[PDB]
């Protein structure tokens, strides 16, 4: 839900009742699943926002296609640029 | 040799009489004047270095074997060996037998290095004795 307040294991996951290899791999899979979760949430939000700005710019340039002036053609020409990258 | 360091002389005179008799095989023997010299000193140095190195060489399991054993076992051997120690389920820390082979091998070297201070030389292996024990045919001569 929120991918900026990283809270790395507020409570401990260690346990004497098992092998040290098991505790080490449980700590590793906690860290790995956390990293995968934060990256997948990030890139899903980026994909959603890129899709939204693509839809909005295409709908705006098609809506601006009817009127023709200096202003309309200038703003159309600004919105002719590609949006697929972050920069 | 080892006891007579840094201690009083009355302890030494009370310790020679506790450690001069030997009741081996229906006979009492006494050692003529055990006296500390430089040879006993260098033997003490070799002994203490070897046992220090084997104390360092002890693994995580062989020092706690009797400590884990003496909770559930009951035997006159274990009781008689426990009282010469101080007072103070669970998990082994890390089983790594690839390290334990090397630890046990070098521990065997250290145990042999402690051992050869009292096992000087076999010079005869007795095969058959005379019945009055005045003689014995034996091998390994030389």
From TrEMBL, chain B:
<protein>
    <submittedName>
        <fullName>Capsid triplex subunit 2</fullName>
    </submittedName>
</protein>
């Amino acid at each position: 839900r929120n991918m900026f307040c990283v809270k790395p294991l507020d409570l401990n996951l260690d346990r004497h009742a098992n092998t040290a290899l098991v505790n080490a791999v449980n700590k590793l899979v906690y860290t790995g699943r956390l990293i995968m979760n934060v990256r997948r949430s990030w890139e899903e939000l980026e994909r959603k926002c890129l899709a939204r700005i693509q839809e909005r710019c295409k709908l705006l340039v098609k809506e601006l296609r009817m009127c023709l002036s200096f202003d309309s053609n200038y703003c159309r020409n600004i919105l002719k640029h590609a949006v697929e990258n972050g920069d | 040799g080892l006891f007579s360091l840094d201690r009083s002389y009355e302890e030494v005179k009370a310790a020679v009489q506790q450690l001069q008799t030997i009741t081996f095989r229906d006979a009492t023997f006494t050692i003529p004047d055990p006296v500390i010299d430089q040879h006993l000193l260098i033997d003490m140095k070799t002994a203490c270095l070897s046992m220090s190195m084997v104390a360092n060489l002890a693994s995580e399991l062989t020092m706690t074997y009797v400590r884990k054993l003496a909770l559930e076992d009951s035997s006159m051997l274990l009781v008689k060996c426990q009282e010469l120690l101080m007072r103070l389920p669970a998990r082994p820390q890390h089983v790594s037998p690839d390290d334990e082979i090397a630890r046990l091998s070098a521990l065997f070297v250290m145990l042999r290095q402690l051992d050869d201070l009292i096992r000087e030389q076999v010079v005869f292996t007795v095969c058959d004795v005379s019945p009055d024990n005045k003689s014995a045919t034996c091998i390994f001569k030389g």
